[PDB]
Structures are given as structure tokens and as C-alpha cells.
Amino acid sequence: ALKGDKKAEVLARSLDSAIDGLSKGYMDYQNDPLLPLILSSIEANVKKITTLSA
Amino acid sequence: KANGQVSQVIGAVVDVQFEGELPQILNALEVQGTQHRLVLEVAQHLGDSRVRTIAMDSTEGLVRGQPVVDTGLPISVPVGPGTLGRIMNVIGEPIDQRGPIKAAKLYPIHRDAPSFTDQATSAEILVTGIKVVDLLAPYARGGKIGLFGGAGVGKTVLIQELINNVAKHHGGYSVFAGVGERTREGNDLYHEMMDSKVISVKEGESRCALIFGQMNEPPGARARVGLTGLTVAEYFRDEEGKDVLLFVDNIFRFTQACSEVSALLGRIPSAVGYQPTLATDLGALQERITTTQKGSITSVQAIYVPADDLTDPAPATTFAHLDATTVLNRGLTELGIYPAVDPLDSTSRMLDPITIGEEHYTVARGVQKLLQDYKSLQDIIAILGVDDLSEEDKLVVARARKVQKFLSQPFFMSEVFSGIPGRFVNLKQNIASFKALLEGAGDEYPESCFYMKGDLEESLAAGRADALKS
Amino acid sequence: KANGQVSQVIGAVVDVQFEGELPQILNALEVQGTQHRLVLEVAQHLGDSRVRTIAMDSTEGLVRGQPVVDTGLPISVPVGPGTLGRIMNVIGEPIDQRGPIKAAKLYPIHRDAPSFTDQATSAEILVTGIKVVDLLAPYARGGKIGLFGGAGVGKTVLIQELINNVAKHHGGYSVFAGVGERTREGNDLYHEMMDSKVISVKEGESRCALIFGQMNEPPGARARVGLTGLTVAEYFRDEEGKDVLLFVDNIFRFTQACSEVSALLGRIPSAVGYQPTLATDLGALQERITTTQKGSITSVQAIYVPADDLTDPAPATTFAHLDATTVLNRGLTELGIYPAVDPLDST
Amino acid sequence: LSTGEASVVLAEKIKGITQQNDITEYGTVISIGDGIARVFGLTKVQAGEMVEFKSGIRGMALNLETDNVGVVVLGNDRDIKEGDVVKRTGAIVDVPIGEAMCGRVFDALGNPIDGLGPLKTTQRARVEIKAPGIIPRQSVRQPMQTGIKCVDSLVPIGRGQRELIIGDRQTGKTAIAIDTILNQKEAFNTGDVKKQLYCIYVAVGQKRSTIANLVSILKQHDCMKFTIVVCATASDAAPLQFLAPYSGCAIGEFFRDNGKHALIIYDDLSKQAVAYRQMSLLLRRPPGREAYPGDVFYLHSRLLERAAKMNDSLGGGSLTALPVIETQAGDVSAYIPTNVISITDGQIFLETELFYKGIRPAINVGLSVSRVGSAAQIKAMKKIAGNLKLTLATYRELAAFSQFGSDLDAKTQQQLNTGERLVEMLKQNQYTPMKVEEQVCIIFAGVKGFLDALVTSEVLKFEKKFLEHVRTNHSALLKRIRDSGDLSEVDTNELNTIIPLFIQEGGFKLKA
Amino acid sequence: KKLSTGEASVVLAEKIKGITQQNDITEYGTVISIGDGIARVFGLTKVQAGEMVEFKSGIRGMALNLETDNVGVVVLGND
Amino acid sequence: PGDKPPAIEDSIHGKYAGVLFSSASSNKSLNKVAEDMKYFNQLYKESEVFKSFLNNVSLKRNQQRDIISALGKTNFNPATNNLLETLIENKRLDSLPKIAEKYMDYYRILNKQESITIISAQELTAAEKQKVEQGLKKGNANVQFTVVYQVDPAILGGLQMYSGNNFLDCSLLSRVNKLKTEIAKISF
Ligand SMILES: Nc1ncnc2c1ncn2[C@@H]1O[C@H](COP(=O)(O)OP(=O)(O)OP(=O)(O)O)[C@@H](O)[C@H]1O
């Protein structure tokens, strides 16, 4: 994700989240795409492993 | 309403900036917003409405601009029977976990010493049960008492035995202020007083108060907790003409704490790194520990001698304030003798033929001459041997070894180390025992029987028993 | 561009005032308008754009307001096989009159010590030929060695014997760094090396490098020449990987030098006049003299004991870094025993 | 737990990751030198609070002055420049604690320098905290077996006490600590939790090569699985050497407060005092005697007073400290040694003369002492230790007469011989810790006088041979002495019979 | 330099204000700092070395250091 | 404003500036003295002789007094004149510049206007900058401010605001580091 190949929305999403944090006293990454992006890969792998006990 | 605010924080020294009506020196300031009650003792006026103070607790967590409240009085601690049987802090906080302390009033730890006209000195023998002390360096009821010792010679064990022997069966109250010493010893003493029923949970009993400013506490606390214990005793003395026993575990820690902050306070260091105000700081405390017309205070304080250097400024200056002095020697420990009371160096202002019986004075001087003569011979004995000595010198050496071993006495508090039960020796029996040894009463028996025995009769019986055993 | 100007000169300590873009600490600055180029390593940022520095050469002749140039990098000395058979200065200048040194690169004399993960035991004995040493305190190749001795007990002679017995037959490269020693000994060693065939003018030979910051040099020079020599050895250890022999004629001088300048830097003196940063500075230099996975460095360090007082802070702090110790006693010299090695104190 | 179920838990855990950022006041550096940074502004900063520079290195705010703030750089200060930014984290110095620490090597701050992997822990404890009060503590009544015969018998160490290993350079100070750590290994392998003792080794001002050799030794004996090594080497900044002992002690308080037992070994505290002196002098604080700050005693006391034996109400945990002190020329009259002796309970004196005369461990029994005394030793131990002590004193007294007088009486000759055999028996090799029960058998053979028969040069080998014989043939006896911890009369008779018998059977030099 | 104890903020403020009132500087002094039984006093000029001075409370002091901007006095009593 | 300077410091220049601030703010005026002190600062760096005069210490007190009068006896608030006289008497004239600077600092602290600096890797488009102003406004919403921009970081897509003495990090670089660290400590 740090690389190119659909990194534009990340910087755009960060700008939106950053303006929010500036607008507010603190900063929370409620809308950052990194966490959902990582979760997508991990959920795919988890779904892949969750087949059956056998 | 907080007028001041923190401006500078270095170590335990804190500077405060005030807007108006600066507090007198020695007053107590309360810092607001701390998780624990933090108190500051005013030490200097720097000008511009600034005061330099010493913190009683850790300064970690302070912040510049933090409001400070002026109490308008020096550190006041609760006094009265409410402190009896309860562990208390330097500022009066209860650290026993048994609840708040009930006090008729709060007294300040700083006060002017009693006048000269109301000194009211008096000499009266104090039977400690320790034959060496009762013989060579008698203690005086109502007079100061010093135990000078290095590291690990047995002055802590000696304090415990005096408590067991004197504190109990004492009409008046007793105070124990332990400043600078280790916390493990504090727990042991508390449990021991509880077992011995000197203190109890049941109210109306527990005739003893405890104050602890142990190592873990930062400087300023170790420097003022001694005054706190002394203030409790002064109330018990003045308000009630009751004999008070003040046990101060090492007081050298008091001057040490002062020197730890003297530099940051701006003072120039003295000869051995101590503060310039060593004598006056110490004398202000000693003069308050005295018997007066109203009541009497019997103070037993332990002075730690660093590196066994009796010329150190702290103990050297303390010597002048003490009525009775007990110097512990490390060489005796190597020999196995306990207590390691140097018979020659130990002195007592009460060792006078008028105060005590002439026979007592005569017996003591004979022992001292005997031991000193033996010490002189040791040199030539090394080169020539005991054989080449004359019969007179041989008798001196033999009797001196027996006397030196007979000086050893097993105390209750020492059983765990040795395994032999403690023993108590009366004054009459002690004088007679040593008087008999001088006459040659025991020159027959082996010197081994005069070891860790209470009285001469007990020692002679043990010798005869060992013979029939073999 | 010469953005700086000399603000104040105090012995070997020089302050410099800059307009902007202050150099990092330990960076090297070059003073302009002075023969015998003068280098100054930044030591402190005093505030208000003033930096206090140490001079490597004599400061006599400096004028307040004189310009100063910022190199932007710490003292960088040439390293490589070109140093072999060549005498170098604390700042890499050749003092053998052999021409410019050919070096692949220039390494900075200030570097962090090797980590905990890069450390090697290498417990293999090094036979010096000296029965007392080999018997009581045997040296371990790849380990640190320290010779402790007072004035004139046989430290320099012992160093020469080790070179004769160990260095010559040695296979890998060698590095001799002299810190605050008599220049005559440097001349004698150079010619003795040429004679022994250990070094020659012919290229491709001379498996030994020489560094000298001898007494005549001012402070700051005797304090960094050790780092310069140490760097020449680190290159051989890491890049070449071969074994290295690092000889250090007395290292105490290094400490001493720093002391002589500490007071001028505004530091409060330590116990007997030494600087408060004695142990840390010494450790930063010593932690780099060690064997790693890349290569081994067998270091022989001579330690001068001032007034025969082993309790002095310098040698006392040095004891902890050494693997093998050889303490020379003056009483034995009176008895005629040479080498005057104290078997009971040499661990 | 199924792998899929575990993976789902892991994914959910990764999901619930919070990260908040708040406005943190920052200041500028007025000056920087020798690792000390004078900072402007940065108000509302707490004393001892941590601050972060631009590069990412931390700093500790010690001096709060009306004008500036005095910060100590916890690392290398080359990147720091005038006008740089200093951001306050808002939290006092702390370190990660837990069980995952065991088997790793950290620095003062807690960062792992092993290279194995990041530290998987969630608990962070403040480094400087008030020591336990008088009530929480409890009397010390459990033995901490070092494995050294001389120590376990003459200078018993009880869990929760503080013993000072004091001596000169190259007298075997570090060897005792390493041997102690090895002895603990047997308890961990066997499932007896009541005797497990986590060992913490704090290395202050030591060459990394030495620590690496030590870790390799620990791995060799597999004793590293329960050991924690905190490293503040000579190259490290002075503040790190100052905080490492406190950092290690906090790691130990974890076990203490959690009903466990921990042994923390502070390498030379003299080196920590030097670092504190350096850090304080550079802060322009007025120096004391030997240039040490006035409150050096408070430094060591606040550290060592932490070690305690908590009461059963809090778990009965304990932290045992073995601080090390290096003396210059055997003068324990120095400033720092004097303070520490007054702080600790007992001290183990190491002498160089004894070391080279063959007495290794070079322990001076005449000076060594323990406050706890026999309260820590086991029942089977105290009985023998008393007679052993009495025998040692007599031997020392008669040593001088024999050399010059050159005439020995039958009674004196026997006492002289008996003491010599015991001294040879107390000798012990390095990296060879002995079980407590085996110590009892060997010390028993000595005090009872059996060793007086065989030649001194054979006493040490008889120890090895006889111990093996006991482990093989007489294993129930050892189990009794171990479990019960007492030497019954039946065991006394059984042991008293086989000792002389074995001496006569095996091939030894019987002439005294 | 570092500073001078005679440069107190209160004394300096009066100079900046421009009001030349010293409340009889001679034979009268105002305490500037007190510590360890030593009081520094601004003013109090015309005071002889080794002379006794009376404080507001009543305790006396001895002028031992006659400095340019202040007088170092040792208080003869509790500080 | 309570005749109390922003900060209290024991340094020489700090002590004098605080007294001047208090005294000036006491009678009525601070802005008048500000121009006087600001004038001295500009002169100290622009006029070479004036700088040499101040630093010159071999000069007598009377000589210093006459030269100062020649500069100007009016256009300086009475507090400033009294301050110069005091400095001459106390040999502190050399520190006059620092005092000036220090004073203005305090004055600039009383100034409500502040400069905010934003650090971002990507170049800030004018439309984006307007949104940033709206956010900073909504954050403060009660104080006017001047914005400054700076783009030369290693962070990406992140904004870091510096406001005088406060720092707020919304950088994505922080998020990256935090996640990589927490994922390591999972302790599965
Ligand atoms: N029981 C022992 N038996 C035989 N040799 C021993 C014994 N103990 C230590 N030695 C030797 O003592 C030397 C190291 O002693 P050690 O490092 O343990 O003490 P130290 O005080 O830590 O020394 P240093 O001050 O250099 O750190 C080694 O040469 C070791 O072989």
C-alpha cells in the first residue's frame, strides 16, 4: 500500500481524516483505509484456513 | 486558597514563587494536585517572594506552576495516647493501615529547647540487665544514652534487648523513632512488640508509639522524622510528668540527610562533605531530649560510625551531648564476644563514687586496669609466648581472659543466632561476680565456663558439670 | 563559503559563531588563512549560534573574527591497503614524505560500537614466547590485551618484543598507533620495521600501518589519533575480514588529553581533576576494539600508571575492558627482574 | 483451540487496534553538550518525564529551572542540534514487564538487543516507585540456594534479603552470581513451583564481549530459559547505566507482586554511581566528596530497599538482590562501599590473597555475615553449620603458631588438621553448583572428623566419588534430606556408617 | 557575570518607577534574603562593621559583611 | 493584566525585563516601551558604533550618560530613561540588547495572533488548503491566525500542525509505525 497501485485514495482518505483531527482537539483514525485493507487480506487468509477440523 | 506556585524543582529541593505574605521559615506547604500528600518545609527566603524548600516525598511528578498552599504553621503532628501502638509517618500519616489517628491536638515539630533554669538534672541508676553496661558505663534515668557502632557490630540487637528489658515493666510510655534504617527491621520490631504485648490492637493499651523515616524515604523526611518522634515524647513529658523512653535508631542518618540537600540549598560543603550547620542542627535536637522539672526522658540513640572512624564529624560532635556512651568494637566480634562493648572506651558520667556505690566504682576501675594491662602484654606475648612471662603476668592474662569472656551475656533477642536463651543479671549479683573474679574466685575453673553466662554461680556450676560429664 | 568566525580562543578550545545552519556535533571545520591547515571538531552547541570546538594543531596565531569553513562531515581519514607502509597523521596527512596516500574511501573516525549480535569469543591462545606471560596470563588472539606500568618499567620494550615475536611471523595486517609518546621511538620503530622487511617502499608489501600523535602534538590531537588508528583497523576487520594486530602505545595519554581540555569546555572536574566523562569516552573507544564475525582484532594497549597509583581513575576504569592484563611492578626492576611482570596482579 | 479459531481471535485482535494522538507541547533546545540538553519552554512538563527528539531518541527531564529544562539524552547525541524540537510524551520512564522477558537480553529502556524478535508483552511498569511499607513485608524464612558450599553454610541467603558481594577485581564476584543462576535450573526442569527462582542479571558498564560470553555459558547449561539480562555497557550513555538497575528491579517487582520469587543481580553498583556522578556534574549540580552527588546513598538505598518478602496476603512473592561492589585495593572504607554495606543485610568479602593461595571461592568467612542467619537455612544445615563455624575459627587462630613455633601438640595437631581438610572441602570449581543435600553429606563428613584420615590433596576427589556413590546406591536418603529438609537420626547413623567405610574401600591416601 | 544580590526586583522596580523614596535609607534597612541564620539587608548604610542591629520582631544581629549593595548579618537568635 | 509578566526568570536580562514589564504595565503603557525597545534592537544591529559603544566597558559612567542623552532624551518612555540610568549605575549596560529582545518576546506572547505551520509530503492544492483553514477554524473558531505551509517530509499523506508551542500529529507515518508495532506484540 505504501507503493503505488491504488495509493491515491489512501492519501486522499488521510487528508480527510487529518482535516478531521485538526478540526478536532485530537486525532483518531476512524476512517483510515490501512486497517480495513489489512483486515481484508487477513480475512481472506482466515476464511482460507477455516475449512473443517479434519 | 493557593497563593504560591512551583517554579524550580531539582532533586528534593523545591523553589516556590509567592504573590504575597510569604510564610515564615520552617512552615509546611501543601502541594495541590498530587496523587499523594506532598509537604514542603520552608528553608530559605531567596527574595522576590521566593522560598526554597525541601520535599518530604518524591518530587517526581511535579510540574512548574503547580499551586502551593501555605498552612501558616510548621509541620504539626498528632500527639497523645492516640499515637500509642500505632505506626506514624514524618508528617503524621498512619502507615499501619488501622485508620486515622485520634489526637487531642497537633503540635509542631519545631520548638525552642527548654531553658537553663528548668533543666532539672538528676542522677539515678538504670538497671538494664546487661552486666558490662551496668558495671562500666551505668545508664542514668533521664539522661541521654549513645550506642556508637560501625556496620554490623550489634547496636540494633542491643536496642531490641533494652526494649525487652526496660520498655516492658515501665510505668511510663515509650517512643521508638527509627530514622534512616532499613524497613525489614521495622517490620520485625512491630511484630515483636505485638507478640510481647507492648502494643496491641485493643485500645487503651499499647503503651508505645512508633515513627519511621526509613531509607526508602527521600531526604528531608529522614531529616525531620526524628523531630517528629521527639515531639510526641515532649507532649508525654510536659503535659504528663511521666517517664518517657525514647529509642532513636540510627541518628547519624539525620545529619546525613541534611548534607544530601545542603549543596542544592546553596551552602558550601564542610570538611568531610557535611553541611556547615552540622553542630547546630544536631544540637537543636539534642537539647530538646532532656529531663526537666515536669517529666523525664531517657533517650537511647544509636550512632552509626562509618568505616569505624570515631573521628567523623557527626559522632564526634554527638559525643558532647551524651551522658552515657557505649562504644561497640568490631575486634570483639571476631573473638566471638557479644555484646561487643569496648570496656575501655565506653564511659558514663554516672561512673562516680558519690553517685554509685564506692564498691561499684572500685570494681569497675579494677576491671579496666586488668584489661588494659592484658592488652599491653599482647605485644610481647606474640614474640616470646605466655610461658616466658612471670607468674604475676600469667595471672593477669588468665584472669583478664576470663573477665573478658564473662562480660559476654546472651540476650533473648539473640537466641536465634546463638541458640541459648537470654539471661538477665541484677546489679548486686553483677558487682559481686566481678568482685569475686578479681579476688581469684574463678582462677581455678576453665575460662570456657565464663562464656554467655548470667551470674558467677551459674558459670561455676556449668564448669563442675562438664567435669562430671568427662 | 566560510560562514563561521572565531569568537574566542582559549588554548586548544575554540568557539565559533555561525550565521546559520550550525554543523552537527563531531563535524570537522577548517580554519582559513593559516598555514598548516587547522581542523576543529565540534564538541558543544552553546546557544545563540555559537559552537565550542577542539583544535588538532597549534592555535597560536589565531585572530578573533577569522573565518571558518564547515566541511559538513566528521574527520575522515583514508583507509585501505594504501596506508600500509605509510605514516599517517591524526587527520590522515602523510608525514613520511612518500607522497599522497591512495585510499579507496575515507572513513569517519567517529562510529558506533559493534552491536551485541556481532561478537565472537575466539578463545585461541597466542604464544608470545614469553614464559611468564604465556604461563600466568596467556594472551588470546582476537582479544584485548593491556600492559599496565609506571614510568620506565619496560612497557615500550615489551611492545617491541611482541612485535618481533608476533607481528613479523603474523599472517594478516597490523596497525601501530602511538598516542602521546616520544617521537624518537617512532623514528626507531619505522627504521627497524624497514630493516626487518616488515615494511618496504615497494608497493604491495609492508603489512603494517603507522599512526602517530606524539607528545609534541597539542590536545585534541592526542585525543583523536587513537580513533584514527582504530578506524584503519576496523576497515581491515570488516571489509577485508582478515586478522588484525592493533598496537597502542600508551592509551592513557588519550584520557589525559581530554582532561587537559575538559576544564576549558566548562565541565566541572571529577575526583582528582579528570573529566566527568572519562569512562564513557574510554568505553566508546574500547568497545570498537573487539573481534566480530567479520574479523578479529588482537589489541595490545599500554597503560601508563601515574605515580604508580593503580587506583587512579584512568587505569582503574581501563581494567574492566581488558581480557588479558599484564601489570608491571617497579620493585622487580630494582631487583633486576625483566620483564618486571607482577604474576599475582596479571590476570 | 483450533487453528482456525485461533486465527479468528488473532484477526479480531488486529481489528481492535486504537491509536489516539493529542496536542503535545514541544520546546526547543537552547544548548546541547556531553549528552545534556538545555531546553526552552516545554512547560507543564513533569519531573522525570520522558521527552522525544526529532531523530527519535528519548530524554529524561531532571532539572526544572525557571528559565529552561535540563534533559539527559538516552543515547548518542550527535544528531541533536540547537533549535531542534523536543516533544513531551507525558509519561514517566517505564519498561515492559512479564514472563516473555525470560530468555532475552534487553537494554536499560527495555528494547531487545538479541535480534530474535520483537517483545510480545502488554505490561509496562514505572521504573521509580515507592518501596513496600512495613506491613506488606514478612520475615525471611526461605533459602535461596546459591550452590556454593561456603556461602550456603556460613553465609546463608534468604529469599527477600539483600547480600552484598564485595571484593577487588578478578576475585570471583561474577562467578558466584553465575553459579547461583545455574543451581536454580534443576527446580525449573522439575515441576516444583515453590522453589523456582527467576534470575535477573543487570550488567552496568561492561564490555559487550563479556556479556556475550556469559549468555553463551547460560545457553550451554540451558539456564537462560529463566534468566533476564539487562545490559548498560560502557559505550552506552551514563543515564542508561543509571536506569538499568532500576529497570531491572521493576521487572523483578512483577514476579514479587505476583506470588513469584525473583533474584536480581546488579553488576558493579560503583559503575552506576560513576554514571550518576557524570550525569549530575554535567547538569551543573554541586559535587560532594569524591565528586559524587550528595544523594548517592539515596540512589542505592531507594533501589535496594525495593527487595522484600511480601506477606501471604499479597501472594508471598519475594525479590532477592545480590549487588556487586568493586574495591580498589581492598579498602572497604571508601565512600560508596561504606554506604552500600550500611544498606544491605550482609556482605560476602572476596580477598585476592585467598584467591591465589588456592582458596577459591576466595571468601573471607571472618568478615562475611548474614542478618537472617540460620532462619533461612534448612534444618539439616543449621546443625552442621554451627560446628563448622566453630571449627573454622579455631583453625585460623592456630595457623600462625605452627609456622614460627614449629611444634604441634596432639590435640592442636588434630584441630589444625581438621581445619585444613574443611578448607580444602569448601573449595569449589567454577560452573559447578552443588545440590543442598549433597552439601550436607560432604559438610557432614568434614565436621564429624572423618576427612582427617585421608590426605588433603585427595579430599576434593573423594567429594566427587562419594557424591556419585550416594546418588547411585543411596538415593532414598537424599530424597529424605531434600523433601523433609531435615537430617534425622536414622540418616545420621546411616551416613555416619558409610562414610568411613567408603574412605577405606576406595583408593585414597589414608595417612593423615 | 551571573547576578548581584543587591539587584532585587523590588529595589529595581523603584528605580524604574522613578520615585526617589528610600524611607531613610541611612540607619534603616530592609531584609532581602534569610537563610541558615544569615540575613542580607539592602540599605542600612552608615552601619559600622561589627555593630548590633534590631529586627522588627526584636531579635538582634551583627553586621559582619559590609558589601557594596547589601549587608550580610548574622542573626543572634532563631531564624 | 495583573501586573505580572508571562514568565519569571532569574537571569540578568530576564530580571530587568520582568521589572520593566511590570512597571510599564503598571502605570499605563506597554506598547510605548515596546517601540522604544524595538528601536534599540534595530539600532544595535544596524549602527556599528552603537554596538561598539554598548559592549565597550572601559567607558566611564558619566561618559555613557552623556552619549545616551545625545542619542535622545525624549521619544523614550520615562521607564526606559530610568532603566538606562539604572543600567549605567549597575554596569549592566552591555546586557541592554538582550533585555530589549526578551521584553518584546513577552509582548509577542501577549499578542493573540499566532502562526500555524502545516507539514505535508504532498503539495497542498489551493482547494485543499481552503478546507484546511476551515478545519483549523472549527478547531479554534475563536482566534484569528495566520497559516504557513512547509512540504519536505518523509511522511506521506500526513498533516502535522505546529502552533507556537503545541504539536499535533495526524501523519499516516505514525499510523504505519503503530500498526507494525502492535501486530508484532500480538503474542498469539
Ligand atoms: N571457584 C573458582 N574456581 C577456580 N577458578 C575460579 C573460580 N572462580 C573464579 N575463578 C577465576 O576468577 C576469574 C574471574 O573472576 P570473576 O570474573 O568471576 O570475578 P570479578 O570480580 O567479576 O572480576 P572482574 O572485576 O574483572 O569483573 C577467572 O579467571 C576464574 O577462572
Ligand SMILES: Nc1ncnc2c1ncn2[C@@H]1O[C@H](COP(=O)(O)OP(=O)(O)O)[C@@H](O)[C@H]1O
Ligand atoms: N548478641 C549477639 N550475639 C551473636 N550475634 C550477634 C549478636 N548481635 C549481633 N550479632 C550479629 O550482629 C549483626 C547485627 O548488627 P546490628 O545490631 O544490626 O548493627 P547495625 O544496626 O549497624 O546494622 C547480626 O549479624 C547479628 O547476627
Ligand SMILES: Nc1ncnc2c1ncn2[C@@H]1O[C@H](COP(=O)(O)OP(=O)(O)O)[C@@H](O)[C@H]1O
Ligand atoms: N628485558 C629487559 N632486559 C633488561 N633491561 C630492560 C629490559 N626491559 C627494560 N629494561 C629496561 O627498562 C627500561 C625502560 O623500558 P621502557 O619499556 O621504555 O619503559 P617505559 O614504559 O617508560 O616506556 C630500559 O631503558 C631498559 O633499560
Ligand SMILES: [Mg+2]
Ligand atoms: Mg541497624
Ligand SMILES: [Mg+2]
Ligand atoms: Mg614507553
Ligand SMILES: [Mg+2]
Ligand atoms: Mg565481574
